[PDB]
Amino acid sequence: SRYFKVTACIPSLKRVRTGRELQNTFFTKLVPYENWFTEQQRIQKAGGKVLSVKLFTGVQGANTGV
Amino acid sequence: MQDAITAVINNYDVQGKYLDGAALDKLKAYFTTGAVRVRAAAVISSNATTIIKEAAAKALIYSDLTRPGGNMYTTRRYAACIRDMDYFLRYATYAMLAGDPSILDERVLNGLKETYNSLGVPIAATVGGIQAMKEVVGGLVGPDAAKEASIYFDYLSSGLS
Amino acid sequence: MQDAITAVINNYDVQGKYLDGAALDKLKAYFTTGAVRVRAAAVISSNATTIIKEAAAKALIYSDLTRPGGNMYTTRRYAACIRDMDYFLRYATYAMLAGDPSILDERVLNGLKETYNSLGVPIAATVGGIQAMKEVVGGLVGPDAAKEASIYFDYLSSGLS
Amino acid sequence: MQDAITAVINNYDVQGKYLDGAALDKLKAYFTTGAVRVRAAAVISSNATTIIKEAAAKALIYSDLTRPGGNMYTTRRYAACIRDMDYFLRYATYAMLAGDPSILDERVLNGLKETYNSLGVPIAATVGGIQAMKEVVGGLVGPDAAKEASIYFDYLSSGLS
Amino acid sequence: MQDAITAVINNYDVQGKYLDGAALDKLKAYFTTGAVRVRAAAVISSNATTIIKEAAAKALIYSDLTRPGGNMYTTRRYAACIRDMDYFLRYATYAMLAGDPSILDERVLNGLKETYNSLGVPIAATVGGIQAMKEVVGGLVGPDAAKEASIYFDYLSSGLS
Amino acid sequence: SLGSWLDAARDLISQNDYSQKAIEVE
Amino acid sequence: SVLTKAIVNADAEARYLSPGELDRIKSFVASGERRLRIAQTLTEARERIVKQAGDQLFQKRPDVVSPGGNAYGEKMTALCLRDLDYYLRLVTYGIVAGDVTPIEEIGIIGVKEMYNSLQTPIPAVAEGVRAMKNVATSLLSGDDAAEAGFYFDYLVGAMQ
Amino acid sequence: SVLTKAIVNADAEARYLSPGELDRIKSFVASGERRLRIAQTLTEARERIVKQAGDQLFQKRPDVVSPGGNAYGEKMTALCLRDLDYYLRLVTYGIVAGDVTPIEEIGIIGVKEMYNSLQTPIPAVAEGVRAMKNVATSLLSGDDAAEAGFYFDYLVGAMQ
Amino acid sequence: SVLTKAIVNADAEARYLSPGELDRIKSFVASGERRLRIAQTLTEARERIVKQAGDQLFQKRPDVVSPGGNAYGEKMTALCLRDLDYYLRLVTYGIVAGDVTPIEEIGIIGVKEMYNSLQTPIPAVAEGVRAMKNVATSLLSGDDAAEAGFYFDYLVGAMQ
Amino acid sequence: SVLTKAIVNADAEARYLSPGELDRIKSFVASGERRLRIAQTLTEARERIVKQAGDQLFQKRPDVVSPGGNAYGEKMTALCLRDLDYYLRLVTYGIVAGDVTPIEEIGIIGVKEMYNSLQTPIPAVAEGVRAMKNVATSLLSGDDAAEAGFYFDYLVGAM
Amino acid sequence: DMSRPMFLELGRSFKGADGQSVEVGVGTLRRQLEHIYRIAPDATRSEKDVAINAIYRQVLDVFAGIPPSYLRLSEAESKLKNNEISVREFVRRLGRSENYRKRFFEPYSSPKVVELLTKHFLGRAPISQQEISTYVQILGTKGLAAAVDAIVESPEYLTIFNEDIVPYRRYPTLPAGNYRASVRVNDEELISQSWSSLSPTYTGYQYVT
Ligand SMILES: *[C@H](C)[C@H]1/C(=C/c2[nH]c(/C=C3N=C(/C=C4\NC(=O)C(CC)=C4C)C(C)=C\3CCC(=O)O)c(CCC(=O)O)c2C)NC(=O)[C@@H]1C
Ligand SMILES: *[C@H](C)[C@H]1/C(=C/c2[nH]c(/C=C3N=C(/C=C4\NC(=O)C(CC)=C4C)C(C)=C\3CCC(=O)O)c(CCC(=O)O)c2C)NC(=O)[C@@H]1C
Ligand SMILES: *[C@H](C)[C@H]1/C(=C/c2[nH]c(/C=C3N=C(/C=C4\NC(=O)C(CC)=C4C)C(C)=C\3CCC(=O)O)c(CCC(=O)O)c2C)NC(=O)[C@@H]1C
Ligand SMILES: *[C@H](C)[C@H]1/C(=C/c2[nH]c(/C=C3N=C(/C=C4\NC(=O)C(CC)=C4C)C(C)=C\3CCC(=O)O)c(CCC(=O)O)c2C)NC(=O)[C@@H]1C
Ligand SMILES: *[C@H](C)[C@H]1/C(=C/c2[nH]c(/C=C3N=C(/C=C4\NC(=O)C(CC)=C4C)C(C)=C\3CCC(=O)O)c(CCC(=O)O)c2C)NC(=O)[C@@H]1C
Ligand SMILES: *[C@H](C)[C@H]1/C(=C/c2[nH]c(/C=C3N=C(/C=C4\NC(=O)C(CC)=C4C)C(C)=C\3CCC(=O)O)c(CCC(=O)O)c2C)NC(=O)[C@@H]1C
Ligand SMILES: *[C@H](C)[C@H]1/C(=C/c2[nH]c(/C=C3N=C(/C=C4\NC(=O)C(CC)=C4C)C(C)=C\3CCC(=O)O)c(CCC(=O)O)c2C)NC(=O)[C@@H]1C
Ligand SMILES: *[C@H](C)[C@H]1/C(=C/c2[nH]c(/C=C3N=C(/C=C4\NC(=O)C(CC)=C4C)C(C)=C\3CCC(=O)O)c(CCC(=O)O)c2C)NC(=O)[C@@H]1C
Ligand SMILES: *[C@H](C)[C@H]1/C(=C/c2[nH]c(/C=C3N=C(/C=C4\NC(=O)C(CC)=C4C)C(C)=C\3CCC(=O)O)c(CCC(=O)O)c2C)NC(=O)[C@@H]1C
């Protein structure tokens, strides 16, 4: 299955948290393709910015094996 | 995101200025157009499916895109493309109500380009599809609203290109 | 993380060497310092809120940052800034007990610059606030403790800048 | 939850009946009351913290409950009690706007007795605290509002007991 | 959970009493026992695997339970049984250090009987296995320690039955 | 190189033969 | 209703109702008397609206009233009209509530799945609702008609 | 703003704006002209409102303007007035927006934590805002004053 | 207690108690006799400690014992002293336990919320505890005082 | 170490060190000089501890050092001794740290996997550590011996 | 009591014994049995492995708290130790795993399957029958995996744990009835069914002779 590598930065604008939230704030991660559309939306609603997207695994424009 | 009203407020808040006559005039300009926008939004929402069908017919399908080797070949990819069309329409409607394009930047344009580049989605065709939606919408909404609606579609298209 | 005792052990383990007198002397040095460090840590914890208030008064507040259009403007941003100050103080205290700067690199320093740049938080001002805290801390802890305390504050500041 | 308007609609929908004049009269009744209720709700929200303080002073504090061994002894338990008070006040306000007691049954009243019994919270004292809040609220809201406010408070109290 | 020291404190806190000599005597009693308990706990931890093996040999294995149809038949069930034995041993050790059986009631004994009944795990045999562990432990720890150790094992067995 | 082990190990093998003891249950 | 929706959002936030949300309730209670009148008008004209809308729909789409089509035959045609009546009743409920929440549970959730089992074509159903709107709008006053339009449009949007 | 809030709820449900939500937008744009007038009145009288409210607060609570108190001394008293001015500006923004969203982001989130560092007493601050409401109400027309009151009340509730 | 804390850490790791953790338990049991003596001293001098600390606190902050202040009036002043007595009792429990767990569950969790309802100023409360420490230190031996200091400091840290 | 463990718990709870946590640091640093002495003794007598324990092990398990056995041959025998030396060094690290973190990362996590591949019998490596304990304990004072014993026992437990 | 200083008299307790203690309502234990775990890239393997073990023990209900090797998933663990995936993405992989499906989906009925989902990820009992119905409709129309994806994607999930925190047992209390329910699901509903169908145990042979 295809996988995306994604970097994003997310701010907490509704509340101020005491515990260390750095891992949540800047998070490079690998996302299954079928999950990414939801995960992009989520970052956008939070008012995070998506710094980078690359397709780690899978071939562009492949009809099968996807 | 920000709308017309909050755009003014934020601009004054950073200066720490109380709202003045100039500010008040801008706000008044929005308030007077508001009722028209609401009517336009209702029209688009009710005709949303039709708008996307018409726009695809005019700009995407019956083409090499839908034929083997094309990006919108396979049911899977056709479905993905008309899914994206639906969001563009919905977000443009939100922008038109808001009277601000910020939401388009925050929740549509951001990371769309990068995703599209990795996929290889053809930008010109997409922009063509956005432009096609614009043309369709203009008819339905009428004189009151057509100009206002159009600018947000144009904003989306220019962002991709 | 790593502490002074473990740092010696790790260095000998990569060599494969059994612990030797020279190594033992470094360990012994830490053990004498340790009692002082514990006393210093208790002082800092009890006076933590005061330390932050004094340091903010010295550098951050009554400034352009607090005034509209500044990063520390708005209650949400003010609160976030004093939260970060508290983090720096707490981690410096942890490092001082540990006798090693590693924990600062592992938790505080890692990713901070990039996050700050996206947020728009001004690094120079933050550094200034850390330096202010150090001076205040120095007074509370007393001179012997202060030297040890200072290096960790300096380590944070250099990392951020 | 269900409100007065929806309650009428639901009753007609199970019958399958179109809305009739008799139904319309019930709806009309709510609409006259509505303006008063909105004003009352705003009063309660602004004075909420004070209402709880006064009610605690009247019933809960300066008592055996606060004294050691009492269920409101310890800061943890004191804080939990005033948290529950706040919930009751908030939900009663919601019910008063809605004009229906159903929401209290669905959200507050369901499982409360059993939970309290396992905790060892004394129900009678809690009821007393609710009654105290009602009296304080009655004063703030004013007489016309008070009658409407009282029924929802009474509904909570009866449910708990 | 509660330990011996905290149990005294809790009893005095409900009274609201400051600690008195009689209370101090109970605390003093624990402090003398403490050194023995620590030594016992280390013995048990080092010999834990052996203790379980010996106890299984004494009660569980070479039996109808291990033979087909028996609960401890199949490798999956055998492994589950020795897993549970290890849990009981670890918690008994914790209880012995604490000097209170409360922890056993909270984590070990909660819902266990009912779960066992639904699973079809035989309670009597389990109890037998706990008693077997106790005997083995008694030998390892030595007599003074054994008396203390025994009560916690007995507490588990009584709970299960 | 484990040179110290190499000489000590052969020294141990020469001083005593393990090939007769047989395991003891003890 | 407007009320229900506002309370629910506040409860999720665990806050008292916002000044803006309170204002919306005030506006709604003022509007209510007018809304009741609009609903009554539609209720009185209901039998006429349904019949006229039916005719338009069948003219707009021959297929539904054809041997292949689902509506074909008397029983089926009656059912199609019954459905139109149901949707009109829902619209009236919506107008008085000021929100589609009541409408949505009864009519819009699971509608696709229900129609797909029946094999009724969804776009035709939407056309019937559009037809009903046109008839209803003519009976209503212009201001009233706009209000009523939104509720009709929501239905058409949901069945799409 | 009203607009922002409506859009955000729709986006979360991934739906077009409800008929009820659309109606609320319509009502707000009609109200807007009146709202602008209310805001202008307060802006003109701002210097007076702040000054008078400060007076009353200090009269109600001698302590804040006393050697123990935070407000004590000229500089401190000025800062306390500056704070009142900030909150008044926020309220005006709120009235034109029709929601506390603008107010809330700038002034109500993290406010407890900020004041706790400063050591300023929160209940006194709330009193200052109450004071400001009373002054503002007198200048405003009765209907206008009620609208303005809600926004003032929200602040007082948040700073508690 | 030390014991409780050690067991809890082991449970989380799902392990038997580590050699290091066992050593910590050993140290605590050795220290216990000294700890009991320290606690007894403070218990005997309790009435004096509370009274002297109260006086110092009232000198430090005139306001609390003033018409504006919460402590004002006989009953209120008594209650403020009662609170100081409660905190002293908790400290003694803490010293024997060797950890603040006893202190924390009875007195530091929800303390902010409780005091905020009462409207008592938290920083003044902290000052009273600091005062109590100074009195207690004088009665205690220097080594004993250091031990006692930590527990007093924790309270001050927890509520400030 | 003791330090690392205390700090890690505090950081997770996002708090300064408890009085209890501080006390444990104080106790540990007082014990430091004694701990260093225990480690030094064992370091000095390393060759003896390994060798005498090795001899006992070969007596206890003749088979391993037999033509059938895995350990058979001088090279193999050397490796078994080398392993014992490694484990002894680890123990000393543990003693000075006052906890197992160093020991655990270097020598126990993944240990099951490695020996199983080699086919060396672990139900016997533990015995070798027991053996080492007996020798090492005889070179220490009673109080020192007990302290050292805990760390040896931990190893035996971990395998 | 006169002659007694008032501050002493106000603290006195008349009830004495037969009064409630600190471990009475919620109690001291459930708090402090809750550890937030965050994996740090820098963290030592011994620190990382304690957090990984906690994941296994919350999501697969490994009471003993140390996963048996067959239960482990190694490739995911290596990506987690490399910091190529987040704790959230590791938890998603576990639920899509076959061990999840055999232990928790296949033996149970869909309504119980949902209860176990919320417990395993989310830490709580299901909030409402409406919550149960949505997840049951996911299970029936789409996978077990699609239901696993929904909870992790859910807003509740993202507020309490986000991407860094390993899930924990949390007994909410915010919605009504949830505190009771969440005590019953985390404290009394030990698992009571066997995952495997084969070799059913015979009732007798209770005593060992
Ligand atoms: C014939 C059984 C039914 C029918 C067909 C019909 N199709 C279209 C248009 C398109 N059909 C496709 C289908 C595919 N493209 C793919 O990639 C795949 C998967 C391999 C399929 C099956 C596409 C993409 C189109 C779009 C136009 C194009 O060819 O690019 C039409 C015309 C659509 C219109 O609206 O004019 C028709 C009529 N219609 C029926 O009624 C039959 C039952
Ligand atoms: C249609 C006009 C054109 C087209 C579309 C197309 N898109 C994808 C895949 C994705 N689209 C997105 C985009 C978004 N992410 C967001 O946050 C938003 C804003 C709401 C959008 C619109 C994403 C994330 C994906 C990838 C994941 C997913 O499929 O959901 C495809 C599929 C590409 C593939 O190879 O699988 C297609 C075809 N491409 C065309 O040909 C049209 C011109
Ligand atoms: C007056 C009603 C009370 C009072 C106020 C007071 N404030 C300060 C100092 C500051 N106040 C603020 C507040 C804000 N910054 C913001 O962004 C906002 C939201 C828009 C507010 C409300 C700030 C940042 C400061 C710090 C100084 C600075 O602004 O640079 C003081 C000064 C006291 C001190 O500095 O210690 C005072 C007195 N004090 C009272 O007691 C009154 C009840
Ligand atoms: C104060 C001296 C300066 C200041 C700070 C500031 N920070 C933020 C936002 C964040 N700060 C951090 C930093 C950390 N989080 C961590 O986990 C760690 C390591 C333990 C650090 C140091 C993070 C991650 C955020 C984002 C989310 C959060 O609240 O944690 C802000 C707010 C910016 C925004 O718009 O979100 C501010 C103001 N800024 C200044 O001007 C001071 C000089
Ligand atoms: C023979 C190849 C090796 C060997 C075997 C051996 N086994 C035991 C004891 C037991 N073995 C079992 C195993 C099973 N129970 C099951 O349910 C299954 C799967 C269906 C198996 C394989 C059991 C339960 C026992 C315990 C005793 C009992 O049966 O109740 C022993 C005896 C050890 C003892 O001390 O009891 C032995 C020797 N041992 C070897 O070394 C051979 C290589
Ligand atoms: C061993 C002496 C006896 C034995 C044990 C046995 N247990 C199971 C299954 C379970 N064991 C438990 C027990 C616990 N779970 C908990 O949460 C706690 C307390 C906190 C305990 C102690 C549980 C819940 C199970 C079920 C699921 C699981 O294995 O995790 C079995 C296997 C039953 C099966 O059919 O799989 C066995 C064999 N049984 C005997 O025959 C011995 C007498
Ligand atoms: C004295 C330093 C400060 C002060 C105190 C004060 N407290 C109250 C009232 C109460 N205090 C408590 C506190 C506790 N209950 C607990 O469980 C604990 C921990 C063991 C504490 C410390 C309680 C419960 C009350 C409520 C009344 C009652 O006891 O039933 C008052 C009077 C109440 C009022 O608000 O008038 C006061 C004055 N006030 C200050 O400002 C001093 C700095
Ligand atoms: C105050 C008037 C009385 C009082 C209250 C009290 N409650 C608890 C503990 C709990 N309270 C609740 C109750 C609710 N949860 C809900 O969802 C609702 C409906 C909206 C209510 C009212 C719950 C579930 C708990 C337990 C979990 C929690 O703490 O959040 C306590 C404390 C018990 C404890 O050990 O902390 C107390 C003291 N008791 C009194 O003394 C007053 C008469
Ligand atoms: C063995 C021939 C050589 C060797 C290997 C080695 N690898 C690591 C650490 C990692 N190995 C990988 C690689 C993979 N993870 C996967 O999932 C896959 C694909 C299926 C591979 C091949 C990863 C990701 C790691 C890093 C994190 C982890 O531990 O999982 C090490 C350990 C380094 C450390 O200290 O952690 C080693 C030793 N190195 C050699 O010496 C051999 C030449």
User: Exposure of C145 by Cβ count < 10 A (0-12 exposed, 13-18 middle, 19+ buried)?
Assistant: buried
Chain J contact present for F4, CB below 8 A: yes
Please list every residue in chain G whose beta carbon sits closer than 8 Å to the beta carbon of residue D9: 93, 96-97, 102
Tokens standing for residue K78: 């290596």
Instruction: Please give the Cα distance from E81 to E61 (Å, whole number).
Output: 11
Ligand 5 centroid from CA E62, angstroms? 10
HSE value, Cβ hemisphere, 13 Å, CA-based, for C112: 21
The answer for residues whose C-beta is within 8 angstroms of residue K193's C-beta and 6 or more apart is: E118, K107, K108
Q: Give the three-state DSSP class for B99.
A: coil
CB G23 within 8 A of CB G45: no
Residue whose tokens read 């549509």? B108
**How many A from CA of C83 to the centre of ligand 4?**
7
Distance, first Cα to last Cα, chain B: 22
User: What count of residues does chain E have?
Assistant: 161
CA separation for the pair K155, A46 (Å, rounded): 11
In angstroms, the first-to-last Cα distance of chain K is 68
The three-class DSSP label of residue A30 is strand
- Residue D70 CB less than 6 A away from ligand 7: no
Amino acid at H115: Y
Name the 3-class secondary structure at A50.
Answer: strand
Give C158's contacts (C-beta < 8 A, 6+ positions apart). none
Contacts E16 to D, Cβ<8 Å: 67-69
Question: Considering only CA atoms, which of G31, D153, D108 is closest in space to residue H20?
Answer: G31
Q: Where are the domains of chain D?
A: 1-161
What is the domain class of E1-161 according to CATH? Answer: mainly alpha
| C-alpha to C-alpha distance for A52 and E146, rounded to whole angstroms | 64
Interface residue E1 vs chain K (CB under 8 A): yes
State whether residue I5 sits within 8 Å of chain E by CB.
no
Helix (H) or strand (E) holding E84: helix E75-98
Opening angle at CA K38, ends K37 and K41, nearest 5 = 140
- Which residues of chain C neighbour B15 with C-beta distances below 8 Å? 68-69
Give resolution in angstroms: 2.9
Chains E and H touch (3+ CB pairs under 8 A): no
Q: Could you tell me how many helices (H) and strands (E) chain A has, helices first?
A: 2, 3
Distance, CA of I103 to CA of H134 (rounded, Å)? 45
**Cβ(B73) – ligand 1 distance below 6 Å:** yes
Chains J, K: CB pairs < 8 Å: 15
Report the nearest-CA residue for atom 17 of ligand 1.
B74
How would you classify residue K122: left for phi > 0, otherwise alpha for psi between -120 and 50, otherwise beta? left
Residue whose C-alpha is closest to residue H107's, from C78, C53, B2, B20: C78
**Do the Cβ atoms of C32 and C144 come closer than 8 Å?**
no
C-alpha G154 to ligand 1 mean position (Å): 29
Q: Which residues of A touch J (CB under 8 A)?
A: 18-20
Task: Say if the Cβ atoms of C49 and I160 lie within 8 Å.
Answer: yes
State the closest ligand 4 atom to the C-alpha of C65, by its place in the atom list counted from 1: 41
Tokens of J109: 């996590």
Chain-chain contact of B13 with C67 (C-beta, under 8 angstroms): no
Residue A31 backbone dihedrals phi, psi, to 5 degrees: -125, 130
**What tokens appear for D59 in the block?**
């019933």
Closest CA to D53 of D77, D89, D94: D89
Furthest CA-CA distance within chain K = 78
* Encoded tokens for D7: 């309650």
Contacts of G105 (CB under 8 A, 6+ apart): none
Spatial separation of the C-alpha atoms in residues H128 and E64, rounded to whole Å = 82
* β-strand partners of A29: A6
- Amino acid at position G90, single letter: L
Ligand 6 centre from K194 Cα, in Å?
A: 10
Q: Is D62 on the interface with G (CB under 8 A)?
A: no
Backbone angles phi, psi at G98, to 5 degrees: 80, 10
Place of tokens 């028996």: E70
CB of A44 closer than 8 Å to CB of B107? yes
Q: Smallest Cα–Cα separation from B8: which of C103, B19, J45?
A: B19
Cα four-point dihedral sign E77, E83, E84, E89 = positive
- The CA radius of gyration of chain J, in Å to the nearest whole number, is 18
User: Which of J5, J100, J101 to mutate: most K Cβ within 10 Å?
Assistant: J101
Q: Is J30 in CB contact (< 8 Å) with chain A?
A: no
CA dist., res. H102 & res. B7, Å (int):
10
- Beta carbon of B126 within 6 Å of any ligand 2 atom: yes
- Are D109 and E55 in contact by the 8 Å Cβ rule? The answer is no
D115 token code pair: 């939970």
H helix runs in chain G, sequence order: 2-13, 19-44, 46-60, 74-97, 101-103, 111-118, 122-139, 142-158
* Nearest residue to I7 via CA among I101, I108, I105, I103: I101
- A19, A23, A30: residue with CB nearest K85: A30
